[PDB]
Design a protein that fits this description.
The structure is a homodimer of 813-residue chains. Chain A is of the alpha/beta class and 813 residues long. The first copy, chain A, has two domains: 486 residues, Rossmann fold (3-Layer(aba) Sandwich); 327 residues, 3-Layer(aba) Sandwich (Rossmann fold), CATH 3.40.50.2000. The first copy, chain A, is built from 33 helices and 25 strands. In chain A, helix 28 crosses helix 29. The two termini of chain A are 25 Å apart. At the A-B interface, helix 2, strand 6, strand 7 and helix 7 of A face helix 2, strand 6, strand 7 and helix 7 of B. The structure holds 3'-azido-3'-deoxythymidine (AZZ) (2 copies). It is classed as transferase. The entry lists the keywords glycogenolysis, type 2 diabetes, Allosteric enzyme, Carbohydrate metabolism, Glycogen metabolism, Glycosyltransferase, Nucleotide-binding, Phosphorylation, Pyridoxal phosphate, Transferase. It forms a dimeric assembly.
């Protein structure tokens, strides 16, 4: 149907149809008489999968022959979403499959909805890993994603009586056609035991063994015939495990629990033993795999060349145990001396920091490591001692610096600071947006920056334009392609060419038309799938992201209530109609986040059923927000809410997705918002609120929320409404926790940004009254969104950290 | 190479090779450069599997159109072994695959050894189920095997220091290419809860739900294009299970433990709750599936025709809960009155008894059923009351009969006798050999036989000649086929034609040649796989079966020691050389059986290293005895030991396997040995020892083992040797338990059969000295083994129990 979706050649369509029928018969063991839509989905998935394998085998063969430097991206999270449409896009198969399925009497879009999300992440950090894999393959890098194959990913969120309920994400129930089990490459991982000292150094003995079984998933580059690998480890008990008889067999579960479930915490550290086991499990199996591949190379025993052939990227501190594990292997097993091993380790490892929030920093109790990983603790102590000797020599007499920089934190419980370990053992440390990277050097890692300034870098985050434009917004990709061609898909800077169309009446009409169609499609989706009725002529005001105090969904709530109260005060006055959509999951143990969800639904309950309001204001909580839902709501959005307190959101990536898809942004000067505004021009952004410096000034003075309550009558009214039970008639004190927090212990200064936020929202509404000028501003945003492609981000990692050159060159088909 | 293995047509070989290469590439994602023999096995398995699916789909389609009476074979055990070679044989593909793999530079026999046994059974009972499935498909019956897909089958047995060690049978590790998951047909199973009474009868409420997910495995008939289904259920937790968060997800294991492991008890009842859950799990899911299929038929609401369209065969009492579960569904859910429901139940169900040993009988504590299955207990009480009212009316005043026949046993703990439940609720009850069936009517079920004589039948066991001749002994199948053609493979009575070749010098030479080749092949196997050296010119004396006191491996041990002592007494005297092979697993908690294994190895330790013995006597314990090992050792055997105490082995089936493969039998008049001897003529069997009547006479008098010890000097010497530490120098009292048992508490009268056994063994040795006459007797055995085909057995079930006609007619290809 549309150009960007590839050719539907007679030969290809015929070949796809017959292979579809073959899979339905031989693979699914069905005929057309008994097949369900799920069967049809699987026959399609298997057909598309077949096109990958040849490229997959020759890509890996190519790397064996050429022996390039290999990039190992270590992450506990890969938030992949669905794979079917993504694979078709990158293989140029979408129109052909659409045609082949149409001719078989099937709707491909219906079949696509059947695929489960691979929900192996929490949010930003996990989704960045997924975007990174796509970009690395697209840029021809010899890259491998390594992680854990969780049996249960992020929970499915149900809303019951306005409250979040969690249910198990049993994503493997019907099978996963994309993965290939590789039981032949199973590796042992050791836990517990004790350390023994001999003439030949230390020995780790009396350990429990858990097996790590790899599952490989293909990662196709964009139309370049490159197919990289994501390898995910699964925990298996050895066959002599605990070997009365029946119980010993049943106890195998204990070992296999390691890969059972993803910890559903976003930007929060929970010091549980199972989590530590997961972290070591991925690290130990991965490093063995890395070393095996290194020894079995066309190049080489000699570990001097190890950093020339291997880069390990640590996605946050979660795989920080890679550092002492690499030391363990090199010193204890390969018998390298400490200094040489350390040189190799530092030159191999690099660390990416994702947040400055203290509650997210990993600080493991020493007693946990002592029991679980006794040899790693000894190595960490030794790293610490040698590192602090370096600090002492550079800053003689500075005893407080020594305590501040120590990997070992003293106190009630002794802890290991994993961030400090990462900096010490990596040749590069990066933040994820310019402002965040500067905050690292100025505040939390100031001491480390003074010692080793060369180590500190910025790599501003990005998103893949394949998933986040072509796949989810084909209509927009197409109108862009009509004007400037298709090259921008793997070279997003070319979107600048769109600036010369900002006064083009045809283009203005097309941009606005694509948005309306997206909005109609999403409005229909809501009725069909959730039985909720919305006005597609209203401004789609959306905030979608994990529920957090720092992300300030509560500030959004305050604005919504302000609009409601203003309408109630002057009912017959004209207001720009809005659909306010808020979505995201709360971590199960995060009480305040669960209260905020309840608040949003409670506001909806009052606002959506007030006859005086009509269809002028609607508040909807978007249930079970996840990658596949993001692909639907983001193209439909007019307004993107990025309203975190300045200095708290390291980068954000949702912001970039909205910019690419034709939404205007209301936000603070936080994270990547700063660079986005810089790229588009501040005139083309709705920036409000305190800057980082203003927050610091308020902290020194002391934040007093009562002041704002006293001086802003509209804010006072909202607090009285919350307190008195206006939004909870049956349970008048339901929201006392929220009011108390806002009035007395608000770390994120919600009240302090209220006035400017409400005023800025009025400026948004005014612009929306003028469709042509709204759309012209939109064009100015889309046109300057190129910097935020993960292809740019990965090219920067490649050149400035990994020491490898990106390549757009095709491999032969 | 050989005739019976089918055609190797140019078209077929070419087509097999290309499909092999396709699977290696697309299915396994490998090329010839990286593929292991395991990969080659899997590519072959997938290629052969493809040939099944078309036949599988049309067989099931055929049953839907024709709507025949369906047979449901309910078993907790299906001892399937390997599937690859069996599938090739039944599809006439073996030579073609052999040729196709040869041309690809691969040895097919090497690839066949890579397949894991499906070890989902303990021994005789589970293997009978497997033979039955093969025969039912071969006879064109619309039959379904229903069971549990255990994650761990029967343990792998390792021998360490002469002791049995158990390790987990992780048979699914590398995947199972034969099964197809059917998550779309998942069904709920209920546990616990309570019973509520309403105006509309009883209601079972507040239950825990476990999901039952079916996996279908194809069962091909012999060259008739029929492919039936074995459906095995797997336990899955529902997604809201226990739904802090992490623990709730981890606790899903509790539910899924139901299908985790096979209870490794052979002929022994262990009253564990998990076992009861397994029994109800298979029954509840199966019956829902049965009823669903019944309602969705071309015929029919009206349950009057239910027994016309459905037969349920209960393999032992393990699925006995089918009876009250069917009542529950019909009464509580379908709202049929009790009397009608009961009529339907009785006419639907039939029960096969497998043993008379009291320790094997299932007697469940009432308190277990009360908690787990409260509604089923109420139904059982009601069945009991109505049944005992019938007994009271037929035998007025006979109060002891009432207590003897009650389904409820009184005592310390109240128990339900599941055998009594089965008889009451089935229209047919059968034993598994003529002598066993007579013992049922005369002893343990005498009262029930007096009440309902019409219910009691015999169905003598059988084995499939496909697996147990063609597959494991192609050399013998071929020389037979040269003389009499190939029709005997699905009509084993035709082997009688071989009687006219008993004086044929060519045939005599060929029979003896096939045995020698088998013996050489097995002797080589032992060296390669276990590094043990044996003389292939010796008589292969083999006893393979589960380790039990009743099977009297100990009597065999006594004979072995007698031979050793006789050699030591007169070293320079000639004795017929023997390799004595004993193999089988002991249940992990069965101490005496584990001691017997230790004894066998201990004897081997002394005998195998005595220079005076030389290669005249060898004692070998065959490790990890299982179906695949049976297929190797049985064709190599000269002497088959079937030496259970008369009246204890209900049938046996190993006996029949040895008879079919050219071994002579030494045995008691027990189980099917009686019918085997009757078929071949007693002159052509080595029968010894007490008959059932002699055992009873000894029981009345009182068995005194001391008497035999006093009067048999050779027996006395063996006991002194055991006691004094002759076979355990480091641990002189190691075998005190065994001696004490033999002397004081021997339920199985080992000493009482010693003299006759030893004398009979001398007659065996004498015959073996005359090769021509040994082989002529062998021919007389093979030639009369036809009755013991499971095709005969199943034809008898079909006609006399299920009310269906067998068919040899081909379905179209
Ligand atoms: C599970 C979870 C809890 N919390 C709770 C833990 C802290 N309890 N205290 N004190 C509180 C403040 O960080 O928030 C959070 O912030 N994020 C989370 O993800
Ligand atoms: C596990 C197992 C134990 N036993 C033990 C249980 C009994 N213990 N007592 N008394 C003993 C005699 O039946 O054998 C058995 O016979 N067969 C088995 O399979």
């Amino acid at each position: 149907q549309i150009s960007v979706r590839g050719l539907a050649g007679v030969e290809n369509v015929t070949e796809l149809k017959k292979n579809f029928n073959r899979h339905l018969h031989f693979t699914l063991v069905k005929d057309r008489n008994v097949a369900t839509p799920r069967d049809y989905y699987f026959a399609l998935a298997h057909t598309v999968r077949d096109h990958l394998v040849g490229r997959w085998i020759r890509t890996q063969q190519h790397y064996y022959e050429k022996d390039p430097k290999r990039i190992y991206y270590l992450s506990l999270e890969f938030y992949m979403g669905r794979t079917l449409q993504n694979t078709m896009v990158n293989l140029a198969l979408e129109n052909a499959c659409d045609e082949a399925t149409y001719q078989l009497g099937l709707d491909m879009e219906e079949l696509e909805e059947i695929e489960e999300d691979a929900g192996l992440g929490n949010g930003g950090l996990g989704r960045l890993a997924a975007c990174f894999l796509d970009s690395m393959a697209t840029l021809g890098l010899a890259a491998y994603g390594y992680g854990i194959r969780y049996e249960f990913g992020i929970f499915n969120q149900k809303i019951c009586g306005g409250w979040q309920m969690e249910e198990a994400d049993d994503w493997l129930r019907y099978g996963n056609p994309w993965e290939k089990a590789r039981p032949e490459f199973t590796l042992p991982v050791h836990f517990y035991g004790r350390v023994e000292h001999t003439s030949q150094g230390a020995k780790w003995v009396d350990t429990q063994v858990v097996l790590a079984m790899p599952y490989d998933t293909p990662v196709p580059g964009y139309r370049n015939n490159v197919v990289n690998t994501m390898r995910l480890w699964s925990a298996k008990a050895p066959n002599d495990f605990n070997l009365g008889y029946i119980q010993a067999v049943l106890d195998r579960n204990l070992a296999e629990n390691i890969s059972r479930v993803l910890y559903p915490n976003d930007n929060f550290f929970e010091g549980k033993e199972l989590r530590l086991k997961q972290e070591y499990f991925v690290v130990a199996a991965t490093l063995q795999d890395i070393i095996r591949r290194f020894k079995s190379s066309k190049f080489g025993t000699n570990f001097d060349a190890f950093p020339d052939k291997v880069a390990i990227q640590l996605n946050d501190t979660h795989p920080s145990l890679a550092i002492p594990e690499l030391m363990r292997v090199l010193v204890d097993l390969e018998r390298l001396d400490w200094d040489k091993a350390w040189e190799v380790t530092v030159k191999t490892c690099a660390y990416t920091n994702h947040t400055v929030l203290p509650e997210a920093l990993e600080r493991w109790p020493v007693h946990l490591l002592e029991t679980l990983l006794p040899r790693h603790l000894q190595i960490i102590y030794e790293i610490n001692q040698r590192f602090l000797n370096r600090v002492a020599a550079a800053f003689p007499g500075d005893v407080d610096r020594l305590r501040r920089m120590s990997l070992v934190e003293e106190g009630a419980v002794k802890r290991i600071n994993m961030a400090h370990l990462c900096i010490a053992g990596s040749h590069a440390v990066n933040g994820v947006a310019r402002i965040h990277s500067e905050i690292l050097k100025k505040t939390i890692f100031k001491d480390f920056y003074e010692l080793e300034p060369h180590k500190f870098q910025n790599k501003t985050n990005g998103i893949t334009p394949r998933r986040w434009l072509v796949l989810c917004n084909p209509g927009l990709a197409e109108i862009i392609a009509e004007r400037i061609g298709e090259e921008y898909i793997s070279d997003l800077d070319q979107l600048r060419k769109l600036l010369s169309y900002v006064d083009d009446e045809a283009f203005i009409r097309d941009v606005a038309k694509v948005k309306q169609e997206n909005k109609l499609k999403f409005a229909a989706y809501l009725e069909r799938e959730y039985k909720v009725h919305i006005n597609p002529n209203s401004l789609f005001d959306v905030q979608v992201k994990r529920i957090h105090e720092y992300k300030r969904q509560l500030l959004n709530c305050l604005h919504v209530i302000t609009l409601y109260n203003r309408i109630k005060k002057e009912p017959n006055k004209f207001v720009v109609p809005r659909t306010v959509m808020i979505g995201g999951k709360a971590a199960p143990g995060y009480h305040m986040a669960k209260m905020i969800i309840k608040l949003i639904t409670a506001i909806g309950d009052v606002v959506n059923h007030d006859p005086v309001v009509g269809d002028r204001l609607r508040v909807i909580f978007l249930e079970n927000y996840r990658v596949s839902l993001a692909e639907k709501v983001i193209p439909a959005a007019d307004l993107s809410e990025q309203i975190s307190t300045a200095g708290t959101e390291a980068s954000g990536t949702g912001n970039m997705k909205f910019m690419l898809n034709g939404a205007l942004t209301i936000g603070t000067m936080d994270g990547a918002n700063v660079e986005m505004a810089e790229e588009a021009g501040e005139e083309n952004f709705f920036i409000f609120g305190m800057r980082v410096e203003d927050v610091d000034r308020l902290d020194q003075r002391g934040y007093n929320a009562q002041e704002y309550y006293d001086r802003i009558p509209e804010l006072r009214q909202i607090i009285e409404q919350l307190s008195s039970g206006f939004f909870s008639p049956k349970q008048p004190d339901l929201f006392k926790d929220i009011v108390n927090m806002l009035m007395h212990h608000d770390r994120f200064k919600v009240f302090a940004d209220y006035e400017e936020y409400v005023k800025c929202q009025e400026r948004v509404s005014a612009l929306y009254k003028n469709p042509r000028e709204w759309t012209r501003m939109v064009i100015r945003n889309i046109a300057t969104s190129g910097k935020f492609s993960s292809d740019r981000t990965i090219a920067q990692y490649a050149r400035e950290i990994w020491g490898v050159e990106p390549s757009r060159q095709r491999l032969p088909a």
